């Protein structure tokens, strides 16, 4: 029954307009009353009446502009007030009485205040839910700008003011709100979900009106308060419907501007406390302090007045809002803490104790919240994941994240994968913004932040970042860091410490390389190193206990390097002692010959750069690496060992002879290349035994050709030759 | 040949008069000269002469002022309550056209010329040219209205009627003696509801009463069908009423107009539920003609 | 363009690259990346993975990823390029590295392990020791300067060494062609 109601309107408005052109208003008034007789239907859906609402609201708008020009130039048909009050059908009457009425406001501003007051009393003549609203909404359109105001020109024949405007439209509004509640209670009990979807359809009908209330600008901060605020608040407490308040309580703070909200939080939060229990409170209060942040953010305006300290009240009153809330999921509660943290960050970025207290209160929120150990699968996790991110990202200094007092007490409820990864997110962030020199105010807490992280390659990454993050310029507290890192890093176990202890050794290296500069400053410089070296050695011994072979060799070596490079007293036997210690692990523990090579070769590279040892323990290990040379299994490395043992005689012919015999102790191609090395070993010490060159140079020429030509001798056949071209030192 | 004489009656004051009009049967309306109580009736009765040569044997011409009422469509039940007579011509002969002026004294006109359902009250000038066999009668009707004023007392009617344990209302009417251009103002005050009223209203029934004694005829006629609270309200709601009487044009009350009939005007509150049950209450108003002051 | 580097020591001796180097090591420009080793983490190599794909690295002593080779020999363009990490050089300091070149039949060598930048030519064969792109610390050498090196067209390789001196990046450039 939707369509033909619109069409029969158009048939009768056709006879209306042809009577509007023929100066037959009354026949057109007869033609319109037949058309307006259609609009009384209740057999339509709330969308069907609304599309039929603007249907005649253009047709009578032809009749509306019909009566206006007639009165303007002097064709004033008098007494039009009761002229449209004849028949017994009120939608023919009142829709015509709207058009005449807003004309009789226009044509008689001496009856402006009267007819604005009178027709809304006549608008009480029908209490139907559907058809009164579309009447009352069309009222607002015809009474848009005709409402009286201080903002009106100076002609002494008008009646009414802004108060006559605001009260009458609230008298429109107070009708229209319960009419939305009268939508909730019309029809059978089978269409209530058909209602409440169509209740959300026609909810913006009354939503037109407070927009018209918002366009008033002569209303000040007080004139809104004691009338227009409470005259909106009255429908809030007296709607008696849950789906009523949801569109409306936003639309107050949505449409009425910023300066109206400032002191008036306290009753509006009491009005939020006055809401029904069944409502979605969540989308409200986030949008509530949406504008106050926007009033804080905006330039070229008033901004937040510091007298209404929003911090001291929103913490209290929106708590009292949840104190009025009875049966809510708790993720709605800390979605306010999403705001209550964040708003404190923007209003007082400077203030220490304010943002210190809210999280402390939020811990004291969770001190009462009898909840489980916070896993990942719930929705309360990801919001809490969002919460602690706002310190670590959005703090000015990210050291102030670490300077937070009650920080780590919040950190205790999390899940095993989360509590590590957020600290990993913390340890990434305190690195990714690169911080400088650190002191004991934030040293220990970070070590307690990794205490949330230990009790992987990322752990391999972050810890090597961590002492690179916890390197400082204080000498001995940084040593106690290297203690208390490792003492904490011993609490992790063994599987991660196999990677992460050598950076602490590398720290302890660089600590000694930080301790090596203060020779002008302090004379206790030598004492710390061997203490730290033993502390490194015990860290090595921890890795010895952690069943690692190839690494603590080098950590002994680079330790013996770090022993050998400093020169603090009694390092050399430790240098040699650990060299021996490592050599002992080499000759005992390490089994693979190639790594044993890679040990014993780099051992000589350490032993050459030990240029650090005196000969009285060198020549022991020079014999012992020659013993370790005999500990080797394959030939050439051992030949390469004794070749390099001649550099440990740096003997001359002694070493050469030994190497020669060893190279003679064995694929003949693989032999003779080493004789060229033996030549170049001789050549090297020749460039510092004259005919042993000339003996061996001719000696290579006879075992050079006697072989199969393959892909590998040919480069070596050249490698023989240019060596003799190198021997051209002229 | 047709008629020989026609009576034409023109008033001496046939210009400064109107007194509105209405009405008659088959939708017709009577507009005549409007008279009131105590006014004199002065005029001229003119005879129309059309055929020259014929001489008219007459034995008397007079005019009777008639104030009469008509009831039950029979000739013998007619009663002329006021009859003043002016003689016009002596028994003689007639040659040309002749006019007859007439001017009586105090013309008491006790009630309104009012035409109801079975009752017509009328005033007319009855001229009687008496001839040998049949007489000439010309009926020139004259409307007369009854003027009562704004009374000293016009009381607030009020009553809390309704249905026991189904509907409690409280009706009210501010006046009782209304005039014909008054406005009908009242209020309704709900107290209790149990039945599901849809939308219903107010009735205006004009009760003209005919018959004397045990023989009394009662006819049903309803002029208007107004509205009400237009719904099924609960406690705390009322119904504002603005009703104009000018859209119906009623006559005055004039109870027991001249010992044979009356006319009265009543209000009925009928309220209709979804099963269309009819629930009524009868209350009279009084009407009387407000004169243009 | 061919990126040359070595001895990252992440997280071993250092952790923080020059951001000056990070912007000069934006991906897309270089074709090949040649590190000596001692990267000490996969993610130190996986940073280099972002820069380019054509990468070949050999094993260092602190390469705890023990699957990199001992040496590497490759030919692209007209150059026959060999590479070592430099720890198997005994002793570090010298002519003796040219003896390593004689084993492998190359014309461009890369060494490392001393963490200083140097690159040079002898016996008409080239040798690289690019130093540490991280500025990874050296045992014997306390003061450390970061530098990465990065162009074979045809018988001619253009060599840009991007060093970190002062407060900017001091790029040096010498030319060497296949003779």
Curated annotation (Swiss-Prot), chain A:
Residues 424-730 are annotated as: Interaction with SLC11A2. GO terms for cellular component: cytoplasm; cytosol; dopaminergic synapse; early endosome; endosome; endosome membrane; glutamatergic synapse; late endosome. Signal peptide: none annotated. The keyword Transport applies. The keyword Lipid metabolism does not apply. Keywords: Cytoplasm, Endosome, Membrane, Phosphoprotein, Protein transport, Transport. It is a peripheral membrane protein. Pfam families: Vps35. InterPro entries: ARM-type_fold (IPR016024), Vps35 (IPR005378), Vps35_C (IPR042491). Detected in striatum (at protein level). Ubiquitous. Highly expressed in fat tissue, testis, brain, kidney, thymus, liver and pancreas, and at lower levels in heart, intestine and skeletal muscle. Detected in oocytes, pre-implantation embryos and at 6.5-12.5 dpc. GO terms for molecular function: D1 dopamine receptor binding. It comes from the Eukaryota. Component of the heterotrimeric retromer cargo-selective complex (CSC), also described as vacuolar protein sorting subcomplex (VPS) formed by VPS26 (VPS26A or VPS26B), VPS29 and VPS35. The CSC has a highly elongated structure with VPS26 and VPS29 binding independently at opposite distal ends of VPS35 as central platform. The CSC is believed to associate with variable sorting nexins to form functionally distinct retromer complex variants. Acts as a component of the retromer cargo-selective complex (CSC). The CSC is believed to be the core functional component of retromer or respective retromer complex variants acting to prevent missorting of selected transmembrane cargo proteins into the lysosomal degradation pathway. The recruitment of the CSC to the endosomal membrane involves RAB7A and SNX3. Belongs to the VPS35 family. This is Vacuolar protein sorting-associated protein 35. It comes from Mus musculus. The gene is Vps35.
UniProtKB/Swiss-Prot annotation, chain B:
The keyword Membrane applies. It is a peripheral membrane protein. One of its GO terms (cellular component) is tubular endosome. Transmembrane segments: none annotated. Its main location: cytoplasm. Keywords: Cytoplasm, Endosome, Membrane, Phosphoprotein, Protein transport, Transport. It is found in: Cytoplasm; Endosome membrane; Early endosome. InterPro entries: Arrestin-like_C, Vps26-related. One of its GO terms (biological process) is intracellular protein transport. Belongs to the VPS26 family. Component of the heterotrimeric retromer cargo-selective complex (CSC), also described as vacuolar protein sorting subcomplex (VPS), formed by VPS26 (VPS26A or VPS26B), VPS29 and VPS35. The CSC has a highly elongated structure with VPS26 and VPS29 binding independently at opposite distal ends of VPS35 as central platform. The CSC is believed to associate with variable sorting nexins to form functionally distinct retromer complex variants. Acts as a component of the retromer cargo-selective complex (CSC). The CSC is believed to be the core functional component of retromer or respective retromer complex variants acting to prevent missorting of selected transmembrane cargo proteins into the lysosomal degradation pathway. The recruitment of the CSC to the endosomal membrane involves RAB7A and SNX3. The SNX-BAR retromer mediates retrograde transport of cargo proteins from endosomes to the trans-Golgi network (TGN) and is involved in endosome-to-plasma membrane transport for cargo protein recycling. This is Vacuolar protein sorting-associated protein 26A. The gene is Vps26a.
UniProtKB/Swiss-Prot annotation, chain C:
One of its GO terms (biological process) is protein transport. GO terms for cellular component: cytosol; endosome membrane; retromer complex; retromer, cargo-selective complex. It is found in: Cytoplasm; Membrane; Endosome membrane. The keyword Ubl conjugation does not apply. It is a peripheral membrane protein. Belongs to the VPS29 family. It comes from Mus musculus. Changing residue 38 to D: Decreases interaction with VPS35. Component of the commander complex that is essential for endosomal recycling of transmembrane cargos; the commander complex is composed of the CCC subcomplex and the retriever subcomplex. Component of the retriever complex, which is a heterotrimeric complex related to retromer cargo-selective complex (CSC) and essential for retromer-independent retrieval and recycling of numerous cargos such as integrin alpha-5/beta-1 (ITGA5:ITGB1). Component of the retromer cargo-selective complex (CSC). This is Vacuolar protein sorting-associated protein 29. InterPro entries: Calcineurin-like_PHP_lpxH, Metallo-depent_PP-like, Phosphodiesterase_MJ0936/Vps29, Vps29. One of its GO terms (molecular function) is metal ion binding. The modification N6-acetyllysine is found at residue 49. Changing residue 150 to E: Disrupts interaction with ANKRD27. Changing residue 89 to D: Decreases interaction with VPS35. Component of the commander complex consisting of the CCC subcomplex and the retriever subcomplex. Component of the heterotrimeric retriever complex formed by VPS26C, VPS29 and VPS35L; within the complex interacts with VPS35L. Component of the heterotrimeric retromer cargo-selective complex (CSC), also described as vacuolar protein sorting subcomplex (VPS) formed by VPS26 (VPS26A or VPS26B), VPS29 and VPS35. The CSC has a highly elongated structure with VPS26 and VPS29 binding independently at opposite distal ends of VPS35 as central platform. SUPFAM superfamilies: Metallo-dependent phosphatases. Keywords: Acetylation, Cytoplasm, Endosome, Membrane, Metal-binding, Protein transport, Transport, Zinc.
């Amino acid at each position: 029954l939707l369509d033909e109601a619109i069409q029969a309107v158009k048939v009768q408005s056709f006879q209306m307009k042809r009577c509007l052109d023929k100066n037959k208003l009354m026949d057109a008034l007869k033609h319109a009353s037949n058309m307006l007789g259609e609009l009384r239907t209740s057999m339509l859906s709330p969308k069907s009446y609304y599309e039929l609402y603007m249907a005649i609201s253009d047709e009578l708008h032809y009749l509306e502009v019909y009566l206006t020009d007639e009165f303007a130039k002097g064709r004033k048909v008098a007494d039009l007030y009761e002229l449209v009050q004849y028949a017994g059908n009120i939608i023919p009457r009142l829709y015509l009485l709207i058009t005449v009425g807003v004309v009789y406001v226009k044509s008689f501003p001496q009856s402006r205040k009267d007819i604005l007051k009178d027709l809304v009393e006549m608008c009480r003549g029908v209490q139907h839910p559907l058809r009164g609203l579309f009447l009352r909404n069309y009222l607002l359109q015809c009474t848009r700008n005709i409402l009286p105001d201080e903002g009106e020109p100076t002609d002494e024949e008008t009646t009414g003011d802004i108060s006559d405007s605001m009260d009458f439209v609230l008298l429109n509004f107070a009708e229209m709100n319960k009419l939305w509640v009268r939508m909730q209670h019309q029809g059978h009990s089978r269409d209530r979900e058909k209602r409440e979807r169509e209740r959300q359809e026609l909810r913006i009908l009354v939503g037109t009106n407070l927009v018209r209330l918002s366009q008033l600008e002569g209303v000040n901060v007080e004139r809104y308060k004691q009338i227009v605020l409470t005259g909106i608040l009255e429908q809030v407490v007296n709607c008696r419907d849950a789906l009523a308040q949801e569109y409306l309580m936003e639309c107050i703070i949505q449409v009425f501007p910023d300066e109206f909200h400032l002191q008036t939080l306290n009753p509006f939060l009491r009005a939020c406390a006055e809401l029904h229990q069944n409502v979605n409170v969540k989308n409200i209060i986030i949008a509530l302090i949406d504008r106050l942040a926007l009033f804080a953010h905006r330039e070229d305006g008033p901004g937040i007045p510091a007298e209404i300290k929003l911090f001291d009240i929103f913490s209290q009153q929106v708590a009292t809002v949840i104190q009025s809330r009875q049966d809510m999921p708790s993720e709605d509660v800390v979605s306010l803490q999403v705001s209550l943290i964040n708003l404190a960050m923007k209003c007082y970025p400077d203030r220490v104790d304010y943002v210190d207290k809210v999280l402390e209160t939020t811990v004291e929120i969770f001190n009462k919240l009898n909840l489980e150990h916070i896993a990942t699968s719930s929705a309360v996790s990801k919001e809490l994941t969002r919460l602690l991110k706002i310190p670590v990202d959005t703090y000015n200094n990210i050291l102030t994240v670490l300077k937070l007092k009650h920080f780590h007490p919040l950190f205790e409820y999390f899940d095993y994968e989360s509590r590590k990864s957020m600290s990993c997110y913390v340890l990434s962030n305190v690195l990714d913004y690169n911080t400088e020199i650190v002191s004991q105010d934030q040293v220990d807490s970070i070590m307690n932040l990794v205490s949330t992280l230990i009790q992987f390659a990322d752990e391999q990454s972050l810890v090597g970042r961590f002492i690179h993050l916890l390197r400082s310029d204080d000498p001995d507290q940084q040593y106690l860091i290297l203690n208390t890192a490792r003492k904490h890093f011993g609490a992790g176990g063994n599987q991660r410490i196999r990677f992460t202890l050598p950076p602490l050794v590398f720290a302890a290296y660089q600590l000694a390389f930080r301790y090596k500069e203060n020779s002008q400053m302090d004379d206790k410089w030598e004492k710390k190193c061997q203490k730290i070296f033993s502390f490194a050695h015990q860290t090595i011994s921890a890795l010895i206990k952690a069943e690692l072979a190839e690494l603590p060799l080098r950590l002994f070596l680079q330790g013996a390097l770090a022993a050998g490079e400093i020169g603090f007293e009694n390092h050399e036997t430790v240098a040699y002692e650990f060299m021996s210690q490592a050599f002992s692990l080499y000759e005992d523990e390490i089994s693979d010959s190639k790594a044993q090579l890679a040990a014993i070769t780099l051992i000589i590279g350490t032993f050459e750069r030990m240029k650090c040892f005196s000969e009285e323990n060198h020549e022991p290990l020079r014999t012992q690496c020659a013993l370790a040379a005999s500990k080797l299994l394959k030939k050439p490395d051992q030949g390469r060992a004794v070749s390099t043992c001649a550099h440990l005689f740096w003997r001359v012919m002694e070493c050469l002879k030994k190497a020669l015999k060893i190279a003679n102790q064995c694929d003949p191609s693989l032999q003779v290349q080493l004789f060229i090395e033996i030549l170049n070993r001789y050549i090297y010490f020749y460039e510092k035994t004259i005919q042993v060159l000339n003996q061996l140079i001719q000696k290579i020429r006879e075992d050079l050709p006697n072989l199969e030509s393959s892909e590998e001798t040919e480069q070596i056949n050249k490698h023989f030759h240019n060596t003799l071209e190198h021997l051209r030192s002229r | 040949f047709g008629p020989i004489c026609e009576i034409d009656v023109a008033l001496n004051d046939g210009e400064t008069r109107k007194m509105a009009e209405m009405k008659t049967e088959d939708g017709k309306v009577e507009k005549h000269y409007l008279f009131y109580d105590g006014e004199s009736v002065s005029g001229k009765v003119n005879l129309a002469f059309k055929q020259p040569g014929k001489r008219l044997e007459h034995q008397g011409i007079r005019i009777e002022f008639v104030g009469q009422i008509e009831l039950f469509n029979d000739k013998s039940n007619t009663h002329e309550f006021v009859n003043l007579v002016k003689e016009l011509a002596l028994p003689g002969e007639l040659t040309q056209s002749r006019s007859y002026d007439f001017e009586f004294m105090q013309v008491e006109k006790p009630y309104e010329s009012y035409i109801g359902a079975n009752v017509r009250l009328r005033y007319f000038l009855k001229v009687t040219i008496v001839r040998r066999l049949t007489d000439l009668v010309k009926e020139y009707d004259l409307i007369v209205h009854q003027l009562a004023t704004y009374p000293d007392v016009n009381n607030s009617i009020k009553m809390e009627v309704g249905i026991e344990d189904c509907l409690h209302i409280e009706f009210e009417y501010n006046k009782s003696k209304y005039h014909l251009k008054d406005v009908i103002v009242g209020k309704i005050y709900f107290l209790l509801v149990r039945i599901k009223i849809q939308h219903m209203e107010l009735q205006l029934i004009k009760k003209e009463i005919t018959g004397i004694g045990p023989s009394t005829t009662t006819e049903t006629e309803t002029i208007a069908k107004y509205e009400i609270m237009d719904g099924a309200p609960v406690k705390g709601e009322s119904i504002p009423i603005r009703l104009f009487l000018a859209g119906y044009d009623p006559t005055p009350t004039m109870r027991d107009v001249n010992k044979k009939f009356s006319v009265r005007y009543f209000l009925n509150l009928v309220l209709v539920d979804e099963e269309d049950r009819r629930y009524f209450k009868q209350q009279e108003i009084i009407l009387w003609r407000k004169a243009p002051e | 363009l061919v990126l040359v580097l070595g001895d990252l020591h992440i997280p071993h001796r250092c952790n923080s690259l020059p951001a000056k180097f990070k912007k000069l090591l934006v991906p897309g420009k270089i074709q090949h990346i040649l590190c000596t080793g001692n990267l000490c983490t996969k993610e130190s190599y996986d940073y280099l993975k972002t820069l380019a794909g054509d990468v070949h690295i050999v094993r260092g002593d602190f390469d705890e990823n023990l699957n990199y080779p001992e040496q590497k020999v490759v030919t692209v363009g007209q150059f026959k390029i060999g590479l070592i990490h430099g720890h198997q050089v005994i002793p570090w300091g010298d002519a003796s590295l040219a003896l390593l070149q004689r084993q492998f039949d190359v014309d461009i060598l890369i060494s490392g392990h001393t963490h200083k930048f140097e690159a040079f030519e002898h016996e008409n064969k080239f040798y690289i020791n690019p130093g540490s792109a991280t500025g990874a610390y050296n045992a014997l050498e306390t003061n450390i300067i970061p530098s990465f090196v990065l162009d074979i067209q045809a018988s001619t390789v253009v060599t840009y060494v991007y060093q970190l001196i002062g407060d900017d990046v001091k790029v040096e450039r010498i030319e060497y062609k296949k003779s």
